[PDB]
């Protein structure tokens, strides 16, 4: 069949090579030719004929996107199941000033991290912002509202009230 | 207007609608005012009156469109159309200075026509409109 | 404007149009008193039954609303259609309002009752034109194909039979 290939960052190939043993041992059994082309600086996976399901090509494409997002590859490539969604949202195309981008990133991080990741934990998302993109993994129902709130926090408005509204919506979800 | 001089009306109107769709909506109000002024002067007066009426229906607070419709009616100098325009102006709601200018425009239209009975009826209607 | 409607007593004038506007205005003048817009897609035709002075709007959606002559409110409604209506016919019996539609069928039932009486499916695809004339309730409908059907009131002959 065809193949899915994408280039990765400088530290992504060093991070992925530490977990490339069990990843390739499961991908080749699932008909995915997961190899790291260090000469070309890219990771590719070819769909072979040793797959018992057609979702292996879709799961390897999501795993390659999770591996190239400079996130934890072993904690983000286990979304091969149906009720496990991992995606990356590029928030770098939201601001122009570097000081405004740094101020928005501090608001997105929150006070000591947990002040803004509490709503991410309430929405059950393993959110990790790396550069201009933020990758989160979890249930699709919990991450759809989380990514919409992340897009609202990525806007030019202050995300302090959005984080407070997200905690209010999480508190109102108990009913 | 060059197509109107070249007797191309339906193709120019479709081009004007396509140009108004491409143009911004804020500039489309002035473009429709320029198109209605071009259609009243160089184009068909029925198309110019239709464009002036449609612009008046689109903007409910356009004294410019009322003046453009008055200028289009004064281009043909029709007494029945001026009486219809005065009735439409009477149907519309105006301010204190706006109704005074409308009564002055109705008096100027009555002075241009020359009907003293209609001028007295317009003055009686203006006094009734003042008593409000 | 999709279609108009003239009052048979020569009083008022209503138009159904593409911008979901049921503009009702004068006949001697163009003085707009009111317009109605509470539908889904648009308004296609307006039916006048001046014997009881009702206003039946055959709208763009399958919903057909019945309006009064004065209050401009919804006294009655018609539902149960599939695709579109586009034309409703007034009735010599003054209540059994006839409705053709975009599915090939004619449905007629009493508007004062509000429950379905007769749904007739002589045509196949979609109806374009439909009209009636008075003393014999004689219904002609023209569909999206070339075929026309003709239906007349003969119920006094049928009730003599059984």
């Amino acid at each position: 069949e065809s193949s899915f290939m994408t280039l990765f960052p400088k530290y992504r190939e060093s991070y992925l090579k530490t977990i490339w043993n069990d990843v390739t041992r499961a991908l080749d059994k699932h008909n995915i030719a997961c190899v790291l082309d260090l000469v070309e600086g890219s990771m590719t996976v070819k769909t072979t004929r040793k797959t018992y399901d057609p979702a292996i090509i879709l799961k390897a494409r999501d795993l390659i996107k999770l591996l190239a997002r400079s996130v934890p590859f072993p904690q983000a490539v286990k979304i091969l199941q149906d009720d496990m969604a991992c995606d990356v949202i590029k928030i770098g195309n939201f601001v122009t000033n570097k000081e405004r981008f740094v101020k928005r990133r501090q608001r997105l991080v929150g006070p000591n991290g947990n002040t803004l990741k509490a709503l991410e934990l309430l929405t059950k998302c393993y959110i990790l912002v790396q550069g201009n993109t933020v990758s989160a993994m979890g249930p699709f129902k919990g991450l759809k509202e989380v990514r919409r709130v992340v897009e609202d926090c990525m806007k030019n408005i202050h995300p302090i009230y959005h984080i407070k509204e997200l905690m209010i919506k999480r508190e109102l979800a108990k009913r | 207007d060059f197509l109107i001089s070249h007797n191309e009306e339906q193709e120019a109107r479709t081009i004007l609608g396509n140009a108004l769709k491409a143009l911004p909506k804020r500039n489309h109000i002035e473009v429709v005012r320029k198109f209605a002024q071009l259609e009243f002067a160089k184009g068909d007066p029925e198309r110019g009156r239709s464009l002036f009426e449609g612009l008046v229906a689109d903007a409910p607070k356009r004294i410019d469109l009322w003046n453009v419709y008055v200028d289009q009616e004064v281009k043909a100098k029709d007494k029945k159309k001026v009486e219809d325009l005065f009735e439409r102006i009477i149907t519309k709601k105006i301010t204190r200075k706006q109704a005074k200018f409308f009564f002055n425009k109705w008096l100027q239209f009555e002075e241009s026509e020359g009907d003293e009975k209609t001028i007295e009826y317009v003055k009686a209607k203006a006094t009734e409109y003042v008593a409000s | 404007i999709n279609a108009l409607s003239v009052s048979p007593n020569d009083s008022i004038f209503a138009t159904a149009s593409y911008d979901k506007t049921c503009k009702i205005w004068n006949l001697e003048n163009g003085e707009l008193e009111a317009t109605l817009a509470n539908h889904k897609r648009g308004l296609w035709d307006v039916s006048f039954c001046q014997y009881d002075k009702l206003l039946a709007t055959s709208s763009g959606d399958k919903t057909v609303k019945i309006w009064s002559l004065d209050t401009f409110s919804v006294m009655k409604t018609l539902e149960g259609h599939t695709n579109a209506v586009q034309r409703c016919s007034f009735i010599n019996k003054q209540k059994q309002l006839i409705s053709c539609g975009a599915d090939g069928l004619i449905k007629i039932w009493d508007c004062s009752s509000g429950e379905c009486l007769k749904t007739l499916d002589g045509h196949n695809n979609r109806l374009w034109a439909l009209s009636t004339m008075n003393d014999g309730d004689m219904i002609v409908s023209a569909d999206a194909d070339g075929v026309f059907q003709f239906w007349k009131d003969c119920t006094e002959q049928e009730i003599e039979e059984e």
Binding site: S2, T47, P54, A55, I57, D87, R147 | - | -
Partner: protein
Amino acid sequence: NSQVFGVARIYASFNDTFVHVTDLSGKETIARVTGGMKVKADRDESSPYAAMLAAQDVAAKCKEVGITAVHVKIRATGGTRTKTPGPGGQAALRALARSGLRIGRIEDVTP
């Protein structure tokens, strides 16, 4: 393989999905799976039960047309949307495994 093949262009979203039966060209008019016509409850269509129910009738008509191998064209919404589907991709893959369709020329048509 005696030219018994086709392509499935699955345009799927978070709460809806659609199937386009394709050849290499626009041929192989087999079927088209609806999104919420199998179950109308605004949560079963997001679940894989209603998507596989529509895919069961889609694969039955696909076998009636005569296309065995399916070339995957996974299309998402893309752009300003989430650019990802819900459970429709896993349900179509499970329906392909249940039908025993041959896997080959699989691609992603997402924008």
